[PDB]
Design an enzyme around this catalytic site. Structure first.
Site, PDB file in Angstrom:
ATOM      1  N   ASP B  25       0.800  -1.201   0.000  1.00  0.00           N
ATOM      2  CA  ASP B  25       0.000   0.000   0.000  1.00  0.00           C
ATOM      3  C   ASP B  25       0.831   1.246   0.000  1.00  0.00           C
ATOM      4  O   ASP B  25       1.339   1.673   1.020  1.00  0.00           O
ATOM      5  CB  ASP B  25      -0.833  -0.079   1.274  1.00  0.00           C
ATOM      6  CG  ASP B  25      -2.098   0.732   1.186  1.00  0.00           C
ATOM      7  OD1 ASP B  25      -2.043   1.894   0.785  1.00  0.00           O
ATOM      8  OD2 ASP B  25      -3.143   0.186   1.515  1.00  0.00           O
ATOM      9  N   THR B  26       0.905   1.882  -1.153  1.00  0.00           N
ATOM     10  CA  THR B  26       1.656   3.138  -1.213  1.00  0.00           C
ATOM     11  C   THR B  26       1.002   4.324  -0.506  1.00  0.00           C
ATOM     12  O   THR B  26       1.576   5.367  -0.247  1.00  0.00           O
ATOM     13  CB  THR B  26       1.921   3.465  -2.706  1.00  0.00           C
ATOM     14  OG1 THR B  26       0.683   3.568  -3.444  1.00  0.00           O
ATOM     15  CG2 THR B  26       2.834   2.414  -3.360  1.00  0.00           C
ATOM     16  N   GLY B  27      -0.272   4.155  -0.216  1.00  0.00           N
ATOM     17  CA  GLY B  27      -0.910   5.266   0.471  1.00  0.00           C
ATOM     18  C   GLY B  27      -0.716   5.187   1.967  1.00  0.00           C
ATOM     19  O   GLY B  27      -1.060   6.079   2.719  1.00  0.00           O
TER      20      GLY B  27
HETATM   21  O1  LIG Z   1     -12.358   2.296  -2.436  1.00  0.00           O
HETATM   22  C1  LIG Z   1     -12.167   2.243  -1.233  1.00  0.00           C
HETATM   23  N1  LIG Z   1     -12.948   1.528  -0.428  1.00  0.00           N
HETATM   24  C2  LIG Z   1     -14.134   0.844  -0.929  1.00  0.00           C
HETATM   25  N2  LIG Z   1     -14.432   0.666  -2.235  1.00  0.00           N
HETATM   26  C3  LIG Z   1     -15.635   0.032  -2.284  1.00  0.00           C
HETATM   27  C4  LIG Z   1     -16.467  -0.417  -3.323  1.00  0.00           C
HETATM   28  C5  LIG Z   1     -17.686  -1.046  -3.001  1.00  0.00           C
HETATM   29  C6  LIG Z   1     -18.080  -1.232  -1.659  1.00  0.00           C
HETATM   30  C7  LIG Z   1     -17.277  -0.798  -0.588  1.00  0.00           C
HETATM   31  C8  LIG Z   1     -16.054  -0.164  -0.871  1.00  0.00           C
HETATM   32  N3  LIG Z   1     -15.062   0.369  -0.100  1.00  0.00           N
HETATM   33  C9  LIG Z   1     -11.078   2.990  -0.530  1.00  0.00           C
HETATM   34  C10 LIG Z   1     -10.461   4.080  -1.187  1.00  0.00           C
HETATM   35  C11 LIG Z   1      -9.441   4.801  -0.544  1.00  0.00           C
HETATM   36  C12 LIG Z   1      -9.034   4.428   0.752  1.00  0.00           C
HETATM   37  C13 LIG Z   1      -9.648   3.338   1.404  1.00  0.00           C
HETATM   38  C14 LIG Z   1      -9.221   2.916   2.770  1.00  0.00           C
HETATM   39  N4  LIG Z   1      -7.787   3.008   3.033  1.00  0.00           N
HETATM   40  C15 LIG Z   1      -7.406   3.619   4.169  1.00  0.00           C
HETATM   41  O2  LIG Z   1      -8.244   3.761   5.038  1.00  0.00           O
HETATM   42  N5  LIG Z   1      -6.160   4.079   4.408  1.00  0.00           N
HETATM   43  C16 LIG Z   1      -5.804   4.356   5.797  1.00  0.00           C
HETATM   44  C17 LIG Z   1      -4.533   3.734   6.294  1.00  0.00           C
HETATM   45  C18 LIG Z   1      -4.160   2.407   5.987  1.00  0.00           C
HETATM   46  C19 LIG Z   1      -2.968   1.859   6.507  1.00  0.00           C
HETATM   47  C20 LIG Z   1      -2.153   2.658   7.329  1.00  0.00           C
HETATM   48  C21 LIG Z   1      -2.533   3.980   7.625  1.00  0.00           C
HETATM   49  C22 LIG Z   1      -1.643   4.830   8.466  1.00  0.00           C
HETATM   50  O3  LIG Z   1      -0.475   4.553   8.675  1.00  0.00           O
HETATM   51  N6  LIG Z   1      -2.236   5.923   8.976  1.00  0.00           N
HETATM   52  C23 LIG Z   1      -1.604   6.773   9.991  1.00  0.00           C
HETATM   53  N7  LIG Z   1      -2.229   7.806  10.573  1.00  0.00           N
HETATM   54  C24 LIG Z   1      -1.407   8.233  11.578  1.00  0.00           C
HETATM   55  C25 LIG Z   1      -1.493   9.232  12.561  1.00  0.00           C
HETATM   56  C26 LIG Z   1      -0.445   9.376  13.494  1.00  0.00           C
HETATM   57  C27 LIG Z   1       0.693   8.542  13.465  1.00  0.00           C
HETATM   58  C28 LIG Z   1       0.822   7.531  12.493  1.00  0.00           C
HETATM   59  C29 LIG Z   1      -0.205   7.358  11.550  1.00  0.00           C
HETATM   60  N8  LIG Z   1      -0.404   6.492  10.534  1.00  0.00           N
HETATM   61  C30 LIG Z   1      -3.723   4.518   7.114  1.00  0.00           C
HETATM   62  C31 LIG Z   1      -5.171   4.481   3.382  1.00  0.00           C
HETATM   63  C32 LIG Z   1      -5.610   5.791   2.697  1.00  0.00           C
HETATM   64  C33 LIG Z   1      -5.521   6.987   3.595  1.00  0.00           C
HETATM   65  C34 LIG Z   1      -4.251   7.528   3.881  1.00  0.00           C
HETATM   66  C35 LIG Z   1      -4.163   8.630   4.748  1.00  0.00           C
HETATM   67  C36 LIG Z   1      -5.330   9.186   5.320  1.00  0.00           C
HETATM   68  C37 LIG Z   1      -6.590   8.644   5.020  1.00  0.00           C
HETATM   69  C38 LIG Z   1      -6.688   7.538   4.157  1.00  0.00           C
HETATM   70  C39 LIG Z   1      -4.702   3.407   2.434  1.00  0.00           C
HETATM   71  O4  LIG Z   1      -3.601   3.965   1.764  1.00  0.00           O
HETATM   72  C40 LIG Z   1      -5.809   3.039   1.469  1.00  0.00           C
HETATM   73  O5  LIG Z   1      -5.320   2.211   0.458  1.00  0.00           O
HETATM   74  C41 LIG Z   1      -6.902   2.246   2.143  1.00  0.00           C
HETATM   75  C42 LIG Z   1      -6.452   0.941   2.844  1.00  0.00           C
HETATM   76  C43 LIG Z   1      -7.578  -0.017   3.133  1.00  0.00           C
HETATM   77  C44 LIG Z   1      -8.149  -0.754   2.072  1.00  0.00           C
HETATM   78  C45 LIG Z   1      -9.265  -1.583   2.318  1.00  0.00           C
HETATM   79  C46 LIG Z   1      -9.797  -1.676   3.625  1.00  0.00           C
HETATM   80  C47 LIG Z   1      -9.211  -0.945   4.683  1.00  0.00           C
HETATM   81  C48 LIG Z   1      -8.099  -0.117   4.442  1.00  0.00           C
HETATM   82  C49 LIG Z   1     -10.673   2.618   0.771  1.00  0.00           C
END
Ligand SMILES: O=C(Nc1nc2ccccc2[nH]1)c1cccc(CN2C(=O)N(Cc3cccc(C(=O)Nc4nc5ccccc5[nH]4)c3)[C@H](Cc3ccccc3)[C@H](O)[C@@H](O)[C@H]2Cc2ccccc2)c1
Lengths: 99, 99
Positions: B25-27
């Site tokens: 996951d690059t995001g």
């Molecule tokens: O289409 C999507 N859905 C979907 N289609 C559908 C079609 C039909 C029906 C239902 C559907 N449903 C969809 C689109 C975009 C993002 C996501 C959800 N999605 C995240 O939620 N995420 C948080 C994520 C994932 C992993 C690690 C972290 C992380 O480290 N965070 C962090 N915060 C911090 C604060 C302090 C200190 C350290 C910290 N670290 C964060 C980041 C994106 C993001 C980044 C930053 C901010 C917000 C969002 C990941 O990149 C994402 O790929 C992905 C990962 C993921 C994928 C699947 C399930 C669960 C998760 C889902």
């Protein structure tokens, strides 16, 4: 171009006449943009992530220009923290992940 | 390897003697795994995502193999619905995103 992952991979998108910055996200199925105005019609839907679900508007046939590359897709617009370009668009710009 | 993004980019990882599949996951800034038993000392952390925030526990200095690549890192374990390898380990395996 090639992008490393030391910084988070952000690019500039042009959508709806507006310029935004967005994450290129291999883990996301769909593209999800923060609230902004598009014209036209949309539909509700819920997507999930970590934390949980958000309800979003689904817009179809939106032209996005990502980096320079035009693409037309569905974008979801809603309460995301970050604009996310997800696999539905990554495939159209030809993105690859190498390791 | 090179992966296109027409399908979710899942890899097999071995962590703590156990075989898992995970999403590259690059995001994602951090690596976040579902609940599993891991030896040791952990600190709770809160992290955010789409849909909200989750409290997770942080193990540092975990060895993980992701494909045949050992990497050693901080791994957060907790209520994510998918295991996610984020940029902290992506960087150790030398992953790149391309278009
Ligand atoms: O289409 C999507 N859905 C979907 N289609 C559908 C079609 C039909 C029906 C239902 C559907 N449903 C969809 C689109 C975009 C993002 C996501 C959800 N999605 C995240 O939620 N995420 C948080 C994520 C994932 C992993 C690690 C972290 C992380 O480290 N965070 C962090 N915060 C911090 C604060 C302090 C200190 C350290 C910290 N670290 C964060 C980041 C994106 C993001 C980044 C930053 C901010 C917000 C969002 C990941 O990149 C994402 O790929 C992905 C990962 C993921 C994928 C699947 C399930 C669960 C998760 C889902």
């Amino acid at each position: 171009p090639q992008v490393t992952l030391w910084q988070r991979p952000l690019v500039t998108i042009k959508i709806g006449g507006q310029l935004k910055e967005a994450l290129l996200d291999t883990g996301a199925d769909d593209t999800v943009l923060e609230e902004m105005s598009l014209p036209g019609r949309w539909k509700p839907k819920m997507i999930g992530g970590i934390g949980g679900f958000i309800k979003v508007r689904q817009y179809d046939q939106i032209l996005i220009e990502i980096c320079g590359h035009k693409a037309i897709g569905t974008v979801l617009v809603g309460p995301t923290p970050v604009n996310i370009i997800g696999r539905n668009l990554l495939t159209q710009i030809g993105a690859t992940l190498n390791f």
